[PDB]
Amino acid sequence: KVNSMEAYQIPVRSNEGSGTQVFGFPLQPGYSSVFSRTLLGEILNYYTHWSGSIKLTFM
């Protein structure tokens, strides 16, 4: 899926229950492969230290 547009898509569906997990990843904005190639991540990888809050918007 990293060789297509599907890497950016988060699947959801109608289930026959509730409370199951949708995704999870760690807050490692420069080192996690989830985050390392974003704008934020690509800038972080030129630096040794980071501080501050982060926003995740879902559509």
Partner 1 sequence: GRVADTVGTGPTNSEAIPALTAAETGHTSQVVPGDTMQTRHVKNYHSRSESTVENFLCRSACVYFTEYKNSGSKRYAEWVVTTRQAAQLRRKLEFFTYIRFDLELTFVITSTQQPSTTQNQDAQILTHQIMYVPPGGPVPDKVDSYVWQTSTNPSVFWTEGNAPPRMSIPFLSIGNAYSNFYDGWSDFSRDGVYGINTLNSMGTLYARHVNTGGTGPIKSTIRIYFKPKHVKAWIPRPPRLCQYEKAKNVNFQPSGVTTTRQSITAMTNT
Partner 2 sequence: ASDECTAGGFITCWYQTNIVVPADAQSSCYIMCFVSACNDFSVRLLKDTPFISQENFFQ
Partner 3 sequence: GYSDRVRSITLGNSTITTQECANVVVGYGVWPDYLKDNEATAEDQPTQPDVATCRFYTLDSVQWQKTSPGWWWKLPDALSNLGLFGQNMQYHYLGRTGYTIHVQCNASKFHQGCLLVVCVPEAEMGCATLDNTPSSAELLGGDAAKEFAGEPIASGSNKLVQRVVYNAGMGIGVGNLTIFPHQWINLRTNNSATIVMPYTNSVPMDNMFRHNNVTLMVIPFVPLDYCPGSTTYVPITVTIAPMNAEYNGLRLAGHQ
For residue 13, state whether it binds partner 2 (rule: CB under 8 A): yes
Q: How many CB atoms lie within 10 A of CB 28?
A: 13
Q: Which two tokens stand for residue 5?
A: 């547009």
Residue 40's φ and ψ, nearest 5 degrees, are -55, -50
Binder to partner 1 among 12, 13, 21, 40 (CB under 8 A)?
21
Which residues, including other chains, have CB under 8 Å from residue 28's CB and lie 6 or more apart?
35
For residue 4, state whether it binds partner 2 (rule: CB under 8 A): no
For the CB of residue 49, give the shortest distance to partner 3 in the complex, in Å: 23
Question: Which residues form the interface with partner 2 (CB under 8 A)?
Answer: 8-15, 18-31, 35, 38-40, 42-59
